[model samples]
Target: FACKTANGTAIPIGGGSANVYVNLAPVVNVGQNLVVDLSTQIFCHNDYPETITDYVTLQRGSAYGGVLSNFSGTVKYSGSSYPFPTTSETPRVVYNSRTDKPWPVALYLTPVSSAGGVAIKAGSLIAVLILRQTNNYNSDDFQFVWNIYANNDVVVPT
Candidate 1:
């Protein structure tokens, strides 16, 4: 489906005249793995501009019913003893104005995070998730996208 992207009409991107390059498809469960490749990139960065002053969210989305992930996590670029734990209740990442480099954003979901009463079970149809995003005006130049592997590693398209 094509979304209405207007830079001057009623729904202008980011409260100003800008171009938005985005593609999204709603996901639903079918008792089996609701898998798909996940990729997101920074958008609306031309007029949005980028600087050492601020940055913006490259990608943002949500899923309810299944176990939600924690908001923060740390990883060792070099050799490490173990995988770091994270929280699922806060913003996934916060781009830093102090650094003049881009960051890599990737995620992996298992059948365990969504455990407990309303957790994602082996044979359950979970709730449909709605996707959304936001960008800050201080940092970033374009867009962000990642390769997502769903249900035993299948590539999904835009």
Candidate 2:
């Protein structure tokens, strides 16, 4: 999985693993809105196709001093063909000032008609994260972590 800028520039994260962290201090500024596109490629080797549900979770790190909000998801398509012909659910956002890291958000893309889950396919557009920089901070001071899960299981790198 990767995060791309509004203009389509890939923002490198921590590593090629399920749980990853990225610092936006260098590429973003206070009072500015950052548009990030979250995408992933899934590979299925079974003789027959399979259906599964997918979702992503985002959490603000302790050092993060900015406000994160405006979460959305989309299923990309080519011409009239959809890579994953499922409907996306409205993203869920929660905030609890009592917690150390209060901002925890989730986005989901699920099958609409399939009884079990959605058919697996290659990578395409999935979720969009709009972050508003509300405060000023140095590098590494403004960071967040995210993870992609399939059927509630973390998607670890192969």
Candidate 3:
């Protein structure tokens, strides 16, 4: 897809007034034995000469019926951990004073905190991420429901 301009106009990339780079299918499973942790980075570049502050919201999407996953997560930016709301709830991530700069925003997931360090049950999970400008200055903001999977080792321990 193309990028959206600061004035909320849709135009082809480089033809627009701004640029946004998002990893459609951000990150897959991490570890070989079991996916102990997962992370994804979102980048947004403002071509305009003013600071843009906004908040990102994450909501639970559909997960295949019968799949089990005990998951917990956090949103991090600039080495700070921001808590997200409970399951099925939309949580927010605040970005402050974002000018014509690129920000490295992140989302992290893990299962260790639950079940006494046990990992999540092998399955697929979906989350809908939305970017909303705090001041409502940009109506062209975007959203996506990203998919990430968790796979645990089935082989008996040696």
Candidate 4:
């Protein structure tokens, strides 16, 4: 799984162990919003069904002098070419901004019912994220990391 920019740049996602940087910086002006799309190409490996839940965590790195706010997420399963039919609940969002500290934000997604587990086809859009920039900063200012849980197992994206 990975985050993609409008220009089709893929930003690698790391497991819980470390942080990953975007290969191409997404530029945004102060008071504007940066939008990113998330995609995945994962299928169940076992015979039995397994439910899936995922989390995307983002942070404004130390170099970022601006604040990120009004974070939001939208699930995009309708045309994502998922192997099985499934229902999704509204994504849960959590964001916190502190002075002189990294701005932390997260989004949680769950497939409410996937009887035989789930299969996300190649380059399927899973979700879209919007983040508003409060001040001006360079493209390298923001940093991101992610964690995914599939049937209680930690999934490290490759």
How would you encode candidate 4's per-residue C-alpha lDDT over 68-157 as one tens digit per residue?
Answer: 111122223322221111233223222222211222232222222221122222222332223222122222222233322212211112
CA lDDT of every candidate: 0.26, 0.24, 0.35, 0.24
For model 2, how does the per-residue alpha-carbon lDDT over 9-118 read when each residue is reduced to its tens digit? 33333212233332221222222333222332221111111331222222221111112111112233211212221233223222222212222232223222221221
Q: What is the TM-score of each candidate against the true structure?
A: 0.27, 0.23, 0.37, 0.23
Every model: Cα RMSD to truth: 11.6, 20.1, 9.0, 19.7
C-alpha lDDT (0 to 100) for residue 32 of candidate 2? 34
Could you say which candidate leads in TM-score? 3
Residue 151, candidate 3: C-alpha displacement in angstroms: 10
Candidate 1 local lDDT, 1-102, one digit each (tens): 011222221212333222222222223222223322222221222222344223333233333323233112122211221122322212323333332222
Looking at candidate 1, the ten consecutive residues that score lowest on lDDT are 1-10
Most lDDT-accurate candidate: 3
Say which prediction, candidate 3 or candidate 4, comes out ahead on TM-score: 3
Task: Estimate the lDDT of model 2.
Answer: 0.24
